[PDB]
């Protein structure tokens, strides 16, 4: 029976407002969708006009975009690490819009290696499992190898992104409203936005 | 307590007025959609599962 | 209050229907359709109050369910179907075609047209928009969606529509010097040549129209409907040619006609 009406509020002058009508159906509100990280659970809501809203109650997968490389991937949502609105929303690990999440980087790592030899970090270490060295070296005709060689020119990943890829988790921002559309979609944090949010997360501790 | 007993195979039905508590003892504390051997209702009822 | 209303009081009806005040409490509530509630002539008003083929609404229903009436070439059995400006009403049984047109008093006159002119109509395009993989669509004043219009056709232009196929035959641009009629406001029903359109960005444009008798008036841009290229209308006009008379001139004409007639 919660309501979003303006007539229960005080006036700009500050005086009380006496209601002339009781609560209307079109003025209703609904309980918040405190979308938690977990196996996909989405409840549909019949809304005004006969349309539907997708109240996502549990999500562990989101379509996040690496915008510098124009690479949108479906990824596992691992953690919630920063919320600008409420710090309770990070303790409870609630997925809302503009909340900062830790997502997986493995599909971004696959697209990373498909444009082979993005910035060299630790690639000469005591590691190299079989069956994926082909995606890095391969037997390529001279034209395709030259194409990869010229792709090497645009192999520039920010140092912070490199540390995140080493950690296996990318910082990302959820640009969707999980409690309204049923998806937790967003974009990988990079640039001054990434620096700002890293500073904020560090200063929270 | 009366018993409205039906036989689906011939689609027949009959109402039996049962007054003795001993016969109905086997029905008490049993929920709906439960199989019970209704041999306590008489000799002709022996072997019937309702 | 809750949901749409379904009735229309007799006195709250549009005044151009020329309904009575003692013939019931209710007026025919026009159905939803191509034209607005207050800018339409319901089929019952046309077939009963104007043409007098029916004395009651039941007789209008009897006439309409025999499929004798066609609006824009399509048989309509809804006796409250909203018929509005430029609509062609054809009765093949009695073999007559009318075009719903405005009189200088702002009322839908009973304007008979030839079978050859009943094959088409004029529509003011209300919007043009590119949609659905790049196809230009054009919406008209009668809610007729036409795909692939001529790229020259813009908003406020007039298009001649062939009623059988619903496709554009020709078009008149909205421009100074073009004949037009007024479809709303005080000057409703008047016909004249556009002389000047003065633009008000963020507000309503005002168009000035000069009569064929020299009289000049103004309307809002939404109330203009281009009728012909230059001063020749593309459609037949009522007994009056869009020239609104003053009350003195109308009184003199009436007196002279009665003197010379009986």
């Amino acid at each position: 029976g919660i309501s979003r009406d303006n007539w229960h509020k005080r006036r700009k002058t500050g005086g009380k407002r006496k209601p002339y009508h009781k609560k209307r159906k079109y003025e209703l509100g609904r309980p918040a969708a405190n979308t938690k990280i977990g196996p996909r659970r989405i409840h549909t809501v019949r809304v005004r006009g006969g349309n539907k809203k997708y109240r996502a109650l549990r999500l562990d997968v989101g379509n996040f975009s690496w915008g510098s490389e124009c690479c949108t991937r479906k990824t596992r949502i691992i953690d919630v690490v920063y919320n600008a609105s409420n710090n309770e929303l990070v303790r409870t690990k609630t997925l809302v819009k503009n909340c900062i999440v830790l997502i997986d980087s493995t599909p971004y790592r696959q697209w990373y290696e498909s444009h082979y030899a993005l910035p060299l970090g630790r690639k000469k270490g005591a590691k190299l499992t079989p069956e994926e060295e082909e995606i890095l070296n391969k037997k390529r005709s001279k034209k395709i190898q030259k194409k990869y060689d010229e792709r090497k020119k645009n192999a520039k990943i920010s140092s912070l992104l490199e540390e995140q890829f080493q950690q296996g988790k990318l910082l990302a921002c959820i640009a969707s409203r999980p409690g309204q559309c049923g998806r937790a979609d967003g974009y990988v944090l990079e640039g001054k936005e990434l620096e700002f949010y890293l500073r904020k997360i560090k200063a929270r501790k | 307590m009366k018993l409205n007993i039906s036989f689906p195979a011939t689609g027949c039905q009959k109402l039996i007025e049962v007054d003795d508590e001993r016969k109905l003892r086997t029905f008490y504390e049993k929920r709906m959609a439960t199989e019970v051997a209704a041999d306590a209702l008489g000799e002709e009822w022996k072997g019937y599962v309702v | 209050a809750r949901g749409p209303k379904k009735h229309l009081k007799r006195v709250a009806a549009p005044k151009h229907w020329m309904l009575d005040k003692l013939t019931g409490v209710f007026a025919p509530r026009p159905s939803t359709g191509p034209h607005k509630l207050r800018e339409c002539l319901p089929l019952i008003i046309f077939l009963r109050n104007r043409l007098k083929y029916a004395l009651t609404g039941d007789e209008v229903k009897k006439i309409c369910m025999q499929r004798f009436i066609k609006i824009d070439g399509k048989v309509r059995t809804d006796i409250t179907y909203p018929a509005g400006f430029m609509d062609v009403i054809s009765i093949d049984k009695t073999g007559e075609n009318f075009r719903l047109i405005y009189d200088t008093k702002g009322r839908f006159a009973v304007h008979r047209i030839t079978p050859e002119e009943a094959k088409y109509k004029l529509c003011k395009v209300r919007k043009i928009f590119v949609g659905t993989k790049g196809i230009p669509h054009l919406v008209t004043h009668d809610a007729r969606t036409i795909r692939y219009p001529d790229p020259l056709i813009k908003v406020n232009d007039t298009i001649q529509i062939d009623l059988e196929t619903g496709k554009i035959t020709d078009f008149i641009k909205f421009d100074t010097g073009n004949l037009c009629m007024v479809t709303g406001g005080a000057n409703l029903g008047r016909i004249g040549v556009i002389t000047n359109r003065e633009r008000h960005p963020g507000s309503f444009d005002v168009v000035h129209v000069k009569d064929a008798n020299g009289n000049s008036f103004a309307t809002r841009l939404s109330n203009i409907f281009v009728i012909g290229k230059g001063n020749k209308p593309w459609i037949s006009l009522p007994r009056g040619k869009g020239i609104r008379l003053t009350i003195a001139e109308e009184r003199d004409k009436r007196l002279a006609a009665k003197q010379s007639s009986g």
């Binding site: 915008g67 510098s68 600008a84 990079e190 640039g191 001054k192 936005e193 990434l194 | - | 960005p201 963020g202």
Partner: protein, 151 residues
């Protein structure tokens, strides 16, 4: 100054700022394009909005508001809110029985963009009507004209 004075990163949603960089194209700073639009009705975009760094989603020129409806005017009387100012619209109301007028006024809370520096009490502001921006704000300052006494 530093526009990141909030708990969330402040940015124009239209502008994509972390495009892939180039070492030779680096000249000390990454460079940032500015999103601005011209509101209609012949109002010029201030040089501040085009070449500023402030983030204000309710700015008519760099935000997400549209100017539609009434264009009004008033004199600035309060500047004690964040990006909002209280202007006073004065008028005369006609009382017919006495064939006379009475001075009336009302105060409008209007959004003021950071693109308008050096706005003072008593300055005249042309404001444009937009969607509800807050509980009481429905107008956005489009132009500022200085008071004659300013020096």
């Amino acid at each position: 100054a530093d526009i990141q004075t909030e708990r969330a990163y402040q940015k124009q949603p239209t502008i994509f700022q972390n495009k892939k960089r180039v070492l030779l194209g680096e000249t000390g700073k990454e460079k940032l394009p500015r999103y601005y639009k011209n509101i209609g009705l012949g109002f010029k975009t201030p040089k501040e909005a085009i070449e500023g760094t402030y983030i204000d989603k309710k700015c008519p020129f760099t935000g997400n508001v549209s100017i539609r409806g009434r264009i009004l005017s008033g004199v600035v009387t309060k500047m004690k809110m964040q990006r909002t100012i209280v202007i006073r619209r004065d008028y005369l109301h006609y009382i017919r029985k006495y064939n006379r007028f009475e001075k009336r006024h009302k105060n409008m809370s209007v959004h003021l963009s950071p693109c308008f520096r050096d706005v003072q009490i008593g300055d005249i502001v042309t404001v444009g009507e937009c969607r509800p921006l807050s509980k009481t704000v429905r107008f956005n300052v489009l132009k500022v004209t200085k008071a004659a006494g300013t020096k």
